[PDB]
Write a protein that binds this ligand. Structure first.
Ligand SMILES: Nc1nc2c(ncn2[C@@H]2O[C@H](COP(=O)(O)OP(=O)(O)NP(=O)(O)O)[C@@H](O)[C@H]2O)c(=O)[nH]1
Ligand SMILES: [Ca+2]
Ligand SMILES: [Ca+2]
Ligand SMILES: [Ca+2]
Ligand SMILES: [Mg+2]
Ligand SMILES: [Mg+2]
Length: 166
């Protein structure tokens, strides 16, 4: 059966691990845990296709990771995650997209822009801003909450559907 290699990237603390664990185990990690497994596997049915999600949960570029570039090279699709209550994390997205462009040696990489923590009231990044950034990359924008599950399945399933177009 088909395997989709997904890589989750973005700034420290935007909720890369919380999103991936909410998808894989239907649990919200409500604390900072500095030692979470990077590799997740799940057999799922997406649009009538039985397939394997192979998910690599990376560290932010500010954190030193020796396995990051190995994870980068093998990725078929990328979730580029910022938090809607973290302007710096949104600004940082360009650097993650440039790194992806560098490693895939293409500007036509399957990607989804994810605005996480959409449950939180302290919004500093407007939907419109993120839509505009995603448009400039030729990719969809999806808002998620790792806490409430809003958009989580949609973010990962949309990325699979983007890989299928490539
Ligand atoms: N309210 C709310 N909190 C969230 C959401 N997603 C993550 N968090 C919280 O934000 C903090 C950081 O989450 P975490 O998943 O570890 O972020 P990360 O991007 O993997 N950090 P790192 O790059 O260091 O691995 C945690 O306390 C987590 O509970 C969300 O959607 N809503
Ligand atoms: Ca807990
Ligand atoms: Ca741990
Ligand atoms: Ca290159
Ligand atoms: Mg993490
Ligand atoms: Mg503003």
């Amino acid at each position: 059966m088909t395997e989709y290699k997904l890589v989750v990237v973005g700034a420290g603390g935007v909720g890369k691990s919380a999103l991936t664990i909410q998808l894989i185990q239907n649990h919200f990690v409500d604390e900072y845990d500095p030692t979470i497994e990077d590799s997740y596997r799940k057999q799922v049915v997406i649009d009538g296709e039985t397939c394997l999600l192979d998910i690599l949960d990376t560290a932010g570029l500010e954190e030193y990771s020796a396995m990051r570039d190995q994870y980068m090279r093998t990725g078929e699709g990328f979730l580029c995650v910022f938090a809607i209550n973290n302007t710096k994390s949104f600004e940082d997205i360009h650097q993650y997209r440039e790194q992806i462009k560098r490693v895939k040696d293409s500007d036509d990489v399957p990607m989804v822009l994810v605005g996480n923590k959409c449950d939180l009231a302290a919004r500093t990044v407007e939907s419109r801003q993120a839509q505009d950034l995603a448009r400039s990359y030729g990719i969809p924008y999806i808002e998620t909450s790792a806490k409430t599950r809003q958009g989580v399945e949609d973010a990962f399933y949309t990325l699979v559907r983007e890989i299928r177009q490539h």
